[PDB]
């Protein structure tokens, strides 16, 4: 039988995208979001009882956790998944690394002392999941996401915000004021690759996994390098710079490149979108011709 | 004159530190705290206050009423929510917070011979994991907010009057019972299982000493601290100096064996010696000696 999937919080950008992907593979009624396109329940992650009820009723074999709210909720999610032999995905992030981490590149196993509350929670998310795998039988799988780039990111704000918003200006061959200093390199990945990796790692055989947390990467680039690749399709496009030190500080704390050697060697992870295929696909979602 | 508070006060570690700090700073200048009723001798030894770390307001009340400036958090579902309360209050009122970490906060993927102050930390015990959490939240609060957070990674502590409380470190304290009367002891860990250990006297002094140091001298806020590392057969060997009829027999417990093997063998405490002058007094011989004179 194909898996039966739960996703939470499934109202987020990643949640919706993933449901679409997974519904296409397993069926519309095999993927249940939670927080018309398909099955949908209200679920309190914070309530173990509700969470237990859902898993049992709908016979859930796979769970993608995209949601103190983090911790109590994470712990709840961990407890339910372990008790009912559920394959659990929970994503991590490049925020899970800090200034004391090897930035160039960051390997899958290294120092992790993030100076941000989001980052610390994700270290904890990683460790708790692995702990549950080793102690109990929890099939825990975790991918560290780079900066995720998406056209439909009506959500503004974030460290990797410029790489989305920049296209709005480039589509009309306008000008863009960048939040980050010219030469600020960060790992980056287009949402298509990101969801595909999330699926793939959840399809991998257990024994081939040498660890349960993985870096995934596609590219790393700098604002001025993104502007270069943009001019391929809009030549008169200009890029000014007006820094937010709070967004720079956090950005400088993150790694420049993610080494994903293990993800490649263990479960054949490969990315399809480099900087050109990204730029093209993104500019296409605005009104721009990408033929050349 | 630092005004001191100690959560988890009824712990063997808590009483020992209170005993040390009161002797140095004055009886009324150091407060013990815990959720449950104390034994008789600690009531009289100095100030004591009921303090529920899970209730923010009760904890804030103590810190303001007794004008607290130094805090040593020995309390640790429950733990991590109490940590956050301790963190907030300490930051709010510019209190010097000490929270202990452990050797259990490393894992197989860590360097184990020796283990640096900065390295891969992926422990496989819920207790180790939550201590990594503790380290990061303390550090996070130092950089972001104005919190003066100071942490030491305690090795397996060896104390005189410890019960048979089942730590992985438990054999090193229970061994001294059978060895005091030349009897036989049965070890739960394998014969050659090396771990970092430390006599309680140093542990407390280190704790006091890192809090006395000035901020500028501190490169980081979580230091390892070392004294010795030994295996059961090495410990037995040192006990046979004072008791050659004492015997050791090995019935391995795979659970602790796995956890012991998950932890480091030696702790590199270079930074602590350079930064704030850390130096242990008790090596294996002295520890073995000192322990036997309380039997």
Span from first to last CA of chain A?
A: 45 Å
By DSSP (H or I, 4+ residues per run), the number of helices of chain A equals: 10
Quaternary organisation of the protein chains: homodimer
Shape category of chain A: globular
Biggest sheet layout of chain A: 8 strands, parallel
Order of helices and strands of chain A: EHEEHEHEEHEEHEEHEEHEHHH
Please bin the fraction of helical residues of chain A: 40-55%
Secondary structure tally: strands of chain A: 13
Q: How many domains make up the 3D coordinates of chain A?
A: 1
The CATH architecture of chain A can be given as: 3-Layer(aba) Sandwich
Q: Which two chains form the greatest contact, residue counts included?
A: A-B, 22 and 23 residues
CATH structural fold name of chain A: Rossmann fold
The gyration radius over C-alpha positions of chain A equals 19 Å
Query: Briefly, what CATH class of chain A?
Result: Alpha Beta
Residues in β-strands, percent of chain A: 15-25%
CATH superfamily of chain A: NAD(P)-binding Rossmann-like Domain
Which structural class do you get from the secondary structure elements of chain A? Answer: alpha/beta
Function (chain A): Catalyzes the NAD(+)-dependent oxidation of L-threonine to 2-amino-3-ketobutyrate, mediating L-threonine catabolism.
GO molecular function, one term (chain A): identical protein binding
EC number (chain A): 1.1.1.103
Catalytic activity (chain A): L-threonine + NAD(+) = (2S)-2-amino-3-oxobutanoate + NADH + H(+)
Set down the secondary structure blueprint:
Two copies of one chain form a homodimer.
Chain A: E1 5-8, H1 13-26, E2 31-34, E3 40-41, H2 48-57, E4 62-65, H3 69-83, E5 87-89, E6 92-93, H4 117-135, E7 140-145, E8 147-149, H5 162-171, E9 175-178, E10 186-190, H6 191-203, E11 213-215, E12 219-221, H7 223-231, E13 238-241, H8 245-253, H9 261-267, H10 275-285
Parallel strand pairs in A: 1-2, 1-4, 2-3, 4-5, 5-7, 6-7, 7-11, 8-10, 9-13
Antiparallel strand pairs in A: 10-12
Subunit structure (chain A): Homodimer.
Keywords (chain A): Mitochondrion, NAD, Oxidoreductase, Transit peptide
GO cellular component, one term (chain A): mitochondrion
């Amino acid at each position: 039988e194909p898996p039966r999937v739960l996703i939470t919080g499934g109202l987020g950008q990643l949640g919706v995208g993933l449901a679409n992907l997974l519904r296409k593979r397993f069926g519309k009624d095999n993927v249940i979001l939670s927080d018309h396109s398909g099955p949908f329940v209200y679920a309190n992650i914070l309530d173990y009882k509700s969470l237990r009820e859902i898993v049992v009723n709908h016979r859930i074999s796979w769970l993608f956790h995209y949601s103190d709210v983090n911790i109590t909720g994470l712990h709840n999610v961990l407890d339910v998944a372990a008790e009912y032999n559920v394959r659990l995905f929970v994503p991590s992030t490049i925020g899970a690394f800090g200034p004391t981490s090897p930035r160039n590149p960051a390997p899958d196993l290294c120092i992790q002392r993030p100076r941000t509350i989001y980052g610390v929670s994700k270290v904890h998310t990683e460790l708790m999941g692995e702990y549950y795998y080793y102690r109990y039988g929890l099939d825990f799988r975790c991918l560290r996401y780079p900066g995720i780039i998406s056209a439909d990111s009506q959500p503004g704000g974030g460290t990797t915000d410029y790489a989305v918003q920049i296209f709005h200006a480039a589509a009309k061959n306008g000008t863009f004021e960048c939040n980050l200093e010219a030469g600020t390199r960060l790992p980056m990945m287009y949402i298509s690759d990101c969801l595909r990796a999330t699926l793939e790692v959840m399809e991998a055989p257990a024994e081939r996994l040498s660890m349960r947390t993985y870096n995934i990467s596609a590219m790393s680039f700098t604002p001025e390098e993104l502007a270069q690749a943009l001019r391929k399709h809009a030549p008169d496009f200009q890029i000014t710079y007006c820094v937010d030190p709070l967004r720079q500080a956090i950005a400088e704390s993150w790694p420049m490149i993610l080494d994903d050697s293990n993800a490649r060697k263990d479960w054949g992870w490969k990315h399809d979108f480099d900087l050109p295929e990204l730029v093209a696909t993104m500019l296409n979602f605005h009104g721009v011709s990408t033929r050349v």
